[PDB]
């Protein structure tokens, strides 16, 4: 547009809290669409939690975000339910990949507009090995994530494999870009 966006080795993060129930992806997306973010942050190391007693309460969000919490724009007030919306880019070579995500509650990850990892409901801590997807051309791929907590425990760690599920890595500053330019 007319405003420069910060270039960092991470995704652009937004946190939203609510006192309504989050049951599914559409509920969290409606929350995101309903207001300005309760806080913004840089999501440079996307391995959050685990903790207890509601992500949206007290300092639980800070604890959940860990290393990334130092970039919070503000300390949100309490809510019962809450979640994050992350957007930016991830450097991937052409090839085949799959996510394996540990989470409480649900989430959705999309790459180049296509969902590649989805849990459309609340759940206690579970790890799902998602189906494989292909990247046609090497470079920075567009990626967005949503995750939420309806209450209770909370964790979010979406790991990626490039080698058919033999090894997995966290998405972090090695490969993330907020704008699709290279972070130095
Ligand atoms: O489905 C029930 C589960 O819901 C999760 O949101 C919560 O973190 C768990 O502790 C358990 O209550
Ligand atoms: Ca801009
Ligand atoms: Ca919004
Ligand atoms: Ca707080
Ligand atoms: Ca941590
Ligand atoms: Ca930090
Ligand atoms: Ca709730
Ligand atoms: Ca929960």
Residue numbers in the entry: 7 to 190
Extract from the study:
MpPA14 (Marinomonas primoryensis PA14 domain) lectin is a domain of a 1.5-MDa adhesin responsible for a symbiotic bacterium-diatom interaction in Antarctica. Bioinformatic analyses indicated the presence of an ∼20-kDa domain near the C terminus of MpIBP that is a member of the PA14 family, which is a carbohydrate-binding lectin module widely distributed across several kingdoms of life. PA14 domains share a β-sandwich fold and the presence of two consecutive aspartate residues in a cis peptide linkage (DcisD).
Galactose has its C-4 hydroxyl in the axial position instead of being equatorial as in glucose. Docking of the galactopyranose ring to MpPA14 via the 3,4-diol is not possible due to steric hinderance against Gln129 and Ser130 on L-9. Instead, galactose can only interact with MpPA14 via the 1,2-diol of its rare β-anomer. Having just shown the 3,4-diol of galactopyranose cannot complex MpPA14, binding of GalNAc is completely abolished because its 1,2-diol is unavailable due to the C-2 hydroxyl being substituted with an acetyl group. Similarly, since the MpPA14 binds galactose via the 1,2-diol (β-anomer), the lectin cannot interact with galactans, as they are polymers of β-1,4-d-galactose.
